[PDB]
């Protein structure tokens, strides 16, 4: 998506279709968040695995969902709820989040646990 100001390069949709890449272009961040929520709800995974989720990405995603008033934020979890607390652990109830960085700290010694290292 284009955040607020920039615009997609011309014929981006056609080039996307030519190179058979499953990328759905969204005109707004709200559409992007709605698409992600719909994908999560339809797939319904048990475990979601990412990097720096519990110290960055999860709070950012929740904040941008709340700010843009994306429909059905509760699709990020498994229980239908109305009000979203500002309660980070309980936000994604029904699914277990696997932070690879945390397990790396708990298992492997290294100078730094960034993705590159």
């Amino acid at each position: 998506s284009k955040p607020k100001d920039c615009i997609f390069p011309y014929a981006f949709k056609e080039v996307i279709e030519k190179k058979n890449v499953k990328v759905e272009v969204a005109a707004t961040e709200r559409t992007l968040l709605g698409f992600f929520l719909a994908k999560v709800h339809k797939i319904d995974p048990d475990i979601i695995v990412g990097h720096n989720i519990y110290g960055f990405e999860l709070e950012v995603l929740l904040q941008r969902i709340n700010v843009c008033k994306a429909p059905h934020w509760s699709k990020i979890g498994r229980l239908k709820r109305s009000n979203m607390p500002k309660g980070e652990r309980n936000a994604t109830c029904g699914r277990m989040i696997c932070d690879v960085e945390i397990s790396a700290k708990e298992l492997i010694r290294c100078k730094s646990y960034h993705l590159s290292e």
Binding site: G55, F56, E59, V60, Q63, K86
Partner: protein, 444 residues
């Protein structure tokens, strides 16, 4: 032959340079030793009486002292402003967050708006440091070692974009008792050293001050150091033919014997520029054993800094040049029409200390273990005495009358001293009614 010529040949003798309160003439005459006089040192354990405790510190002790300072000030501000909870400095947060810390520069130079760093407390952020951005801040006034609470935006956890600066809250005023309001009017003279010109040892300004004290017969006289200047040319090169202790004793004896007929109480406050004393802040009271029984009721030795109630009126006495040390390392958003002295006085009164700047000036020895106990403000003083090399002034800041008469002798020419009239009005009214009625800064 040459020394002490310019001061003796002065022509501005007796000129009044500043007045505050109610208009008064030149006939400032008191009762001397008549009536009831209540001189008592108050506060924490009493202003330290012994010599000292140590000349050897431990770094964890200093760490504990600083952490306690930050924690108590932050708890007081949280209780005042009803803050829900503080946030760790290193934890990212998209929503605006409030942080508790102390201001500091990132290098060894002068603090400026591009070099501000906030250092968190041990309880919350485990002593973490983050740079602070002041581009979006409208009004601020910052100096190193200022315990502050900021409200800003920290989305990456590595830099704070400050948006609001909470104003500090001073200590409550001293609550008068029914006995304190029954006292009568009194006069206090205040003077600060050095008492001799930069090229002489005759101490002519000291004799002039003795003559003025005898003439005006005030109720109390406060004399600040140095009595033997460490920066004096004849002292720093060791030209004197007598020990420093002997010369100090001679000067003290001359002062005490001269004002014996006046019957006015004398309060000697030491300074870090005294050669014969220990150069560590806070300083113990002057040591003097050749004292007769009659003079033991008229001569008192207090520490530095001191919280001293005179007739139920609290005085904050400090000989260090706090105004010049703090005023040089301050940053503010306004410079066109603003009083620097009032701003730094507000900082001093809201920081709850006698030397709030950290780290202090490069030539300043501070024992922090004794600083944490013997150098705290118990309450907001009724009158604050802060003599400084800057221009003489008398300002009413936050209900406190702060008077700086300046040095009695500046360089080769003479200086000024101050006199204050004290009386406590009726208790009931609009709460704060200043006991200090009139202040007059007069040239010597």
């Amino acid at each position: 032959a040459t020394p002490s010529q310019k001061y003796n040949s002065r022509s501005n003798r007796g000129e009044v340079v500043t007045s505050f309160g109610l208009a008064q003439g030149v006939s400032w005459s008191g009762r001397g030793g008549a009536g009831n006089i209540s001189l008592k040192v108050l506060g924490c354990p009493e202003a330290l009486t012994g010599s000292y405790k140590s000349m050897f510190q431990k770094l964890p002790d200093i760490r504990e002292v600083l952490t306690c300072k930050i924690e108590e000030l932050g708890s007081e501000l949280k209780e005042h402003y009803k803050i829900e909870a503080f946030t760790p400095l290193l934890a990212p947060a998209q929503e605006p967050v409030t942080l508790l810390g102390q201001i500091g520069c990132d290098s060894n130079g002068k603090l400026n708006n591009k070099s501000v760093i906030l250092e968190g407390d041990r309880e919350h952020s485990s002593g973490a440091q983050i740079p602070v951005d002041l581009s979006e801040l409208k009004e601020y006034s910052l100096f190193p070692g200022q315990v502050v609470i900021m409200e800003g935006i920290n989305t990456t956890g590595r830099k704070l974009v400050a948006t609001k600066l909470y104003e500090g809250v001073p200590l409550p005023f001293y609550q008068p008792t029914e006995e304190d309001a029954d006292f009568e009017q009194s006069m206090v003279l205040v003077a600060c050293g050095p008492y001799t010109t930069s090229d002489s040892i005759t101490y002519d300004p000291l004799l002039d001050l003795i003559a003025v004290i005898n003439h005006d017969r005030p109720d109390v006289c406060i004399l600040f150091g140095p009595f033997l200047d460490a920066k004096h040319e004849q002292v720093e090169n060791c030209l004197l033919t007598s020990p420093f202790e002997d010369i100090f004793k001679q000067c003290l004896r001359t002062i005490i014997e001269g004002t014996r007929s006046s019957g006015s109480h004398l309060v000697f406050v030491p300074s870090l520029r005294d050669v014969h004393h220990e150069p560590v802040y806070p300083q113990p009271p002057f040591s003097y054993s050749d004292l007769s029984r009659e003079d033991k009721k008229q001569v008192q030795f207090v520490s530095e800094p001191c919280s001293l109630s005179i007739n139920g009126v609290i005085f904050g006495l400090t000989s260090t040049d706090l105004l010049f040390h703090l005023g040089a390392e301050e940053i503010s958003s306004s410079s066109g029409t603003s009083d620097r002295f009032s701003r730094i006085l507000k900082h001093i009164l809201t920081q709850r200390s006698y030397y709030p700047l950290y780290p202090p000036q490069e030539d300043m020895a501070i024992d922090y273990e004794s600083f944490y106990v013997y150098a705290q403000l118990p309450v907001t003083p009724d009158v604050l005495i802060i003599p400084s090399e800057l221009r003489y002034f008398v300002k009413d800041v936050l209900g406190c009358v702060c008077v700086n008469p300046g040095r009695l002798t500046k360089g080769q020419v003479g200086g000024t001293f101050a006199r204050l009239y004290l009386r406590r009005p009726a208790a009931d009214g609009a709460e704060r009614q200043s006991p200090c009625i009139a202040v007059q800064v007069v040239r010597i």
